[PDB]
Design a protein around this ligand. Sequence first.
Ligand code: CLA
Ligand code: CLA
Ligand code: CLA
Ligand code: CLA
Ligand code: CLA
Ligand SMILES: CCCCCCCCCCCCCCCC(=O)OC[C@H](COP(=O)(O)OC[C@@H](O)CO)OC(=O)CCCCCCCCCCCCCCC
Ligand SMILES: CC(=C/C=C/C=C(C)/C=C/C=C(C)/C=C/[C@@]12O[C@]1(C)C[C@@H](O)CC2(C)C)/C=C/C=C(C)/C=C/[C@@]12O[C@]1(C)C[C@@H](O)CC2(C)C
Ligand code: SF4
Lengths: 210, 739, 208, 40
Amino acid sequence: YLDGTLPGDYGFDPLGLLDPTVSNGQGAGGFVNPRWLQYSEVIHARWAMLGAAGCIAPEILGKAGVIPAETAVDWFRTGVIPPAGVYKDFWADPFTLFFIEVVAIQFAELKRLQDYKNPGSQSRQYFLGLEGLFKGSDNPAYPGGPFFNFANFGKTEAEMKKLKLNEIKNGRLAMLAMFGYGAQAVITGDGPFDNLLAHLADPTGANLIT
Amino acid sequence: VKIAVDRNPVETNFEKWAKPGHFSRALAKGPNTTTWIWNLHADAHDFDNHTSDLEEISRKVFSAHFGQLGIILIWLSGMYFHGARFSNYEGWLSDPTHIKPSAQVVWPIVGQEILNGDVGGGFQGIQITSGFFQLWRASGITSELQLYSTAIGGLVLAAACFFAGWFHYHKAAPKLEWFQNVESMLNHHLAGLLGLGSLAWAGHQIHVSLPVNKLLDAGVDPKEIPLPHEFLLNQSIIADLYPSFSKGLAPFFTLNWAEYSDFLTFKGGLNPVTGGLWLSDTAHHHLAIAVLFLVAGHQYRTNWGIGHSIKDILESHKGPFTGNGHAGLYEILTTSWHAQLAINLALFGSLSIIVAHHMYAMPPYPYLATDYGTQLSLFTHHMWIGGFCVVGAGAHAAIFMVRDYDPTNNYNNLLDRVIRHRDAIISHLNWVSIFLGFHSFGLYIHNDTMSALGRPQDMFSDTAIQLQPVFAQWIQNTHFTAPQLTAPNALAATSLTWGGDVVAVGGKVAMMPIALGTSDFLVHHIHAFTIHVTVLILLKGVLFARSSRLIPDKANLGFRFPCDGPGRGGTCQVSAWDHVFLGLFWMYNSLSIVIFHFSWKMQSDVWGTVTDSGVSHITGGNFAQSANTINGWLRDFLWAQSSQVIQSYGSALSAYGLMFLGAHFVWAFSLMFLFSGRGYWQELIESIVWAHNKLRVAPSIQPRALSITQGRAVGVAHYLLGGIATTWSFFLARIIAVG
Amino acid sequence: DRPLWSPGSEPPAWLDGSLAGDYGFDPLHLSEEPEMRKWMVQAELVHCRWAMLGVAGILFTSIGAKAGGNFPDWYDAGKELQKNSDIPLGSLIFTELLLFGWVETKRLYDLRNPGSQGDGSFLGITDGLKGKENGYPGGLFDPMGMSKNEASFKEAKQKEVKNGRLAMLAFVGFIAQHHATHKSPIDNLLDHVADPFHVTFATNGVSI
Amino acid sequence: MKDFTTYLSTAPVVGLGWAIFTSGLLIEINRFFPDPLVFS
Ligand code: CLA
Ligand code: CLA
Ligand code: CLA
Ligand code: CLA
Ligand code: CLA
Ligand SMILES: CCCCCCCCCCCCCCCC(=O)OC[C@H](COP(=O)(O)OC[C@@H](O)CO)OC(=O)CCCCCCCCCCCCCCC
Ligand SMILES: CC(=C/C=C/C=C(C)/C=C/C=C(C)/C=C/[C@@]12O[C@]1(C)C[C@@H](O)CC2(C)C)/C=C/C=C(C)/C=C/[C@@]12O[C@]1(C)C[C@@H](O)CC2(C)C
Ligand code: SF4
């Protein structure tokens, strides 16, 4: 059933979750289906594309002389998992920032969900004049618009398909990387860049086998 | 193999809540008699009778089972919560031997505060006998905050389980194909559930429970204990307790597993401090159990062209004497739920019986063997649960023969050949019961008659015509002398019941060798009498459910019917339902003596306070001499041990004195239903309806006496409840007031 | 055709939009029947109007206490004012219960039967004391002619409800950030304005 | 909601509300006024 029309189709579905036989009826139903799984693949990718860039950027810039070493700290010692460590000097405590996080996000996320349940629904109601930017598209993962694609890149359809899968190939790689950051940290107890600096120095001596 | 689901089959609304009886065609009309009410609550969960579709029956079952889990999880969370806020766990943890548990404090209205007894620990409440305190200590739990969080987790998971039952029925319900993928269930339920679940517990045992219980047994105060997360983060702390942790998973991947001998052990026996199993041994057990179930889960074929297929296995084990054997069973078990329910209940009930034996001799939790009320309550509980479950197999197997039996699939099969020599089964089994009841119970009457006549030399006893169980005695020594020869690496034996020395804890013995004699011979043979008979009643009902010589057409009458009629001299209680109704009385007579065997034996020969000069048992070791006579069971067990219950008025055990009486009322009350019949009562109601009619106050729903099968069910229910609740009061009051 | 509590959600069938402060918010399907809907709109307004009347009393005193005036906290005010009063407790309660039973009962029978209290029995009053709508009387409770215009009456109904929902949320606030801080509401305000980043609900020592 | 109120009007649900009333009434009448036997 994998025709290959999709961007990131390379014929790898051993367990057959994307088949159209499952969820035969019509309705909302369950989450295992082509409409939701295709959507969550890029969402896990985009969030991971941001995370893997940010988990290693302060450490690299810290080894370099640009950023102060006080701020340059391992991604797991910056406030998450306070047993690991906690940055004392922010402009506010973590829990105050979490309420900022929960609020400003839960607008963004639930507004996106209603567009999945009811396309174009968020433009119809008044939202401080920002309604023109949320018109959406046929595919919810790639809405586009005056903001999300403010610089219209793929005016041609063929160029979009090339970009639509470069978003995935560069993205599915990042998901693996973050899985490496978590596993590296537990065993090594050090940042991801310092672990690289060791394998380049003593590869045979610094390794998972060790 | 693949996933298959049907979206939004059923709309969710309260429309059918207002219309009771919608599931059945007969009940959807409405009530004109009061019999409609009893049939409603009865036929509610008989999904096979509602509709012929096997798919809908599967959707209903898979979603109802989610309900029992949610019902369990709020019950389980209640114990954790009630143990956190209304208990003395922190006090008992610091002085377990002297302080008694309690988690059910009572409110102060009329009387009812005296039940809050002086338990100890600056606390007063009801004394529990469920063994939660020893369970929470076997795992690392020092504070009440851990119990609160554990309770909130259960409510969260329980709502998810309830949510799933709605989702996987009302919104997105699987298809019949998804259910018939049987080979994937065993693969997932062996490896995933039993395999990883045991492996995970070893993670909790290894990383948390072992160090915490090591410090607690070394006299350290609970508040000074490092919290269990500290052992995870700090490799240095736990290394001080078990130095093997310093190496850090290099021994595992290099296959040098001897380094882990510090905390993975084969000690055997019991802990001298706690009177419980070595916690290091259990982590090794559940670890090896995981590797065993993991390989078992990679057996079948599911999708990747490797593995076995259950159908080819079954239809390949054939024999001459059997003919066509095991052939048409894969079609049975994949099509009828009742067949599986019969098999599973049989081995889920016989397992709880195995749990009851294998805990009392091998106390896994600390400070359990010294809590005699707890050790006696878990045995009695998990045995009764086994008897009910086993009897359910005889009921839920006869339903298969009546409803889901197609003779076309079964020709010269194992199931067909069993029916064709059924009269040989019941006949040969009838002789055994008579042989045993004579040679077993007749021996008791012989001892009674000899004693009353003044001929005690002629009784069956130790000072007498001894009948000693030589085979069990040989097995006790073999398992006792095993560490020398058959299990060299074993430091000691599995339990001290086989042989050895006493293990004393808090001045009380946890376990000591049990000696078998002439009395233990008679009792172990009395149990076989009650068992071979209980099988006769159920097995007869199964084979003769579909047809008999008296009634060649029972299957058309159905599973439960009272009688065909007065003809043929009488056809009352001929159905398979009425065989189950009789088997329950024999299950009761069986386990009631298995339980009396456990109480008098362990009080007299095992339990007691250890002094400088030996042990002083509770009943002075009178099981050997008195048990041979039935009057001994009446004098030394019933009349004697009932002193604590009867004298409970004016103390915290007063509730047991009342339940002891109320249990007798409900028992005798059942006799009205068993002895009598519907006919007398329906006429009496007519003379009562006249007065209610004379005053123009009469129900439009006509009053009708209970059906025949209902009067029989109502009897055995109030019967068993009164018979079982009496022991529940006679035991806990006897044992809580120790001796 | 109008805003909603969650954009894109289909509003219920029974909430047409004529009622004041209607945003299609009733997931429990309450007020689905006409008679219950006729009861709840009157319950919402009294729970509102009592909130406004009460919360203003708390701000007035808590401000007068912070300025210097002799006013106590809104909590533990009935305990310190009864210690030194000539009116015992019990004579003050059943002066309130007895006097409200008159009003609260007359309001009930206008609900069950509109225009019923304007018969002229009570002191010869007929044109007043008959309801204009369910929870919106007039004549005597509207001395200023601020309701004899449907254009300016329909939006005023929207302001009565919007400043009301907000008001009875605030009363839940006073309960909550009193139990945490055990201080007045105004004192909690000046602290947040003084050091907004540091003094929040996270740093009160509670709710964590 | 019309069907929910109808379910609440069934026999056992109405009986539950009755039982809490009669039982809670008798208990609170024994919580206060403890141990009555003679009626003044
Ligand atoms: C509020 C949500 C909701 C609603 C409106 C419905 C509505 C409906 N369900 Mg559904 N269902 C729900 C939640 C819901 N369900 C959940 C959460 C589950 C998972 C358990 C199911 C599982 C389910 C199944 C499996 C079936 C239905 C069916 C039905 C229909 C018949 C309802 C009926 O007979 O009422 C019954 C009304 C009750 C109040 C039942 C209460 C039962 C509780 C759980 C027992 C409590 C135990 C008690 C406390 C123990 C003490 C007793 C003591 C003696 C031991 C109806 C369309 C049936 C159907 O399709 O119609 C043919 C059907 O077969 N539902
Ligand atoms: C590793 C996978 C896995 C696991 C762990 C389970 C586990 C379970 N299955 Mg199961 N099942 C599986 C795969 C699995 N199944 C597959 C592949 C199929 C189809 C071939 C089925 C079909 C199936 C049926 C038809 C039934 C079960 C049932 C059960 C439950 C038995 C209750 C019990 O013994 O108490 C143990 C109880 C617990 C340990 C409590 C934990 C409960 C949580 C919610 C379950 C978490 C595991 C869940 C399956 C993960 C996926 C859910 C996710 C998609 C949301 C148990 C939770 C029965 C059931 O649903 O009863 C409710 C039942 O009737 N299973
Ligand atoms: C996994 C366990 C299990 C399951 C799922 C079922 C399921 C079923 N059984 Mg079965 N059964 C079981 C175990 C089980 N049974 C066991 C262990 C036995 C042996 C005792 C039986 C004996 C049995 C018989 C003899 C019959 C069934 C029947 C049925 C069906 C109808 C259910 C019904 O009427 O209940 C609806 C619910 C009730 C009737 C309420 C039960 C109330 C009980 C009796 C009172 C409990 C008292 C309480 C614990 C203590 C007193 C306190 C009180 C004040 C609250 C259904 C398919 C009947 C049938 O027609 O099968 C097709 C039938 O005739 N079963
Ligand atoms: C104390 C009461 C009592 C007694 C003694 C019996 C006895 C018996 N029941 Mg039984 N039963 C009872 C109550 C009792 N029942 C009740 C209340 C129920 C209702 C649930 C049942 C339901 C029931 C069923 C459903 C079944 C039995 C069966 C049996 C027989 C098993 C065979 C056996 O071991 O006999 C051997 C003999 C004895 C146990 C007698 C003991 C006393 C001694 C040995 C006799 C001494 C004789 C003496 C020397 C001769 C004197 C002669 C004189 C005239 C001079 C046996 C006759 C089973 C049966 O008949 O099939 C095999 C069977 O299937 N019973
Ligand atoms: C959740 C499990 C459950 C349980 C335990 C019961 C139990 C009962 N139901 Mg039932 N029922 C259930 C689920 C359940 N039902 C479901 C899911 C439905 C579908 C909506 C029904 C629908 C239903 C109907 C339609 C009727 C019952 C009736 C009854 C009662 C039988 C009549 C009787 O003996 O009193 C005989 C009573 C008298 C002769 C005189 C009146 C005095 C009574 C005893 C006082 C009130 C008792 C009170 C309800 C007890 C509290 C509830 C209790 C379970 C804790 C009995 C109490 C019948 C009834 O009238 O209930 C009272 C009845 O007509 N049930
Ligand atoms: C627990 C001890 C109980 C033992 C006494 C019980 C005797 C009652 C049974 C008599 C039925 C005889 C007719 C057989 C029925 C028969 O004809 O079937 C034929 C069957 C041989 O089958 P085939 O090889 O032809 O085919 C098998 C295939 O059909 C596979 O399905 O015979 C046996 O299996 C012998 C069974 C002996 C059964 C006695 C032992 C049962 C207990 C097992 C433990 C015994 C050893 C104990 C010592 C430690
Ligand atoms: C690998 C992965 C990662 C998720 C990846 C998604 C991720 C990791 C989320 C990333 C977000 C991040 C990292 C942000 C973090 C931070 O905010 C904090 C928390 C902490 C701060 O210190 C720093 C910052 C950065 C601020 C995805 C795994 C799924 C796999 C492999 C499945 C493979 C298959 O084989 C199967 C099973 C089944 C087949 O039918 C289908 C496929 C698909 C073929
Ligand atoms: S009702 Fe009584 S007499 Fe008639 S067939 Fe049934 S058991 Fe026999």
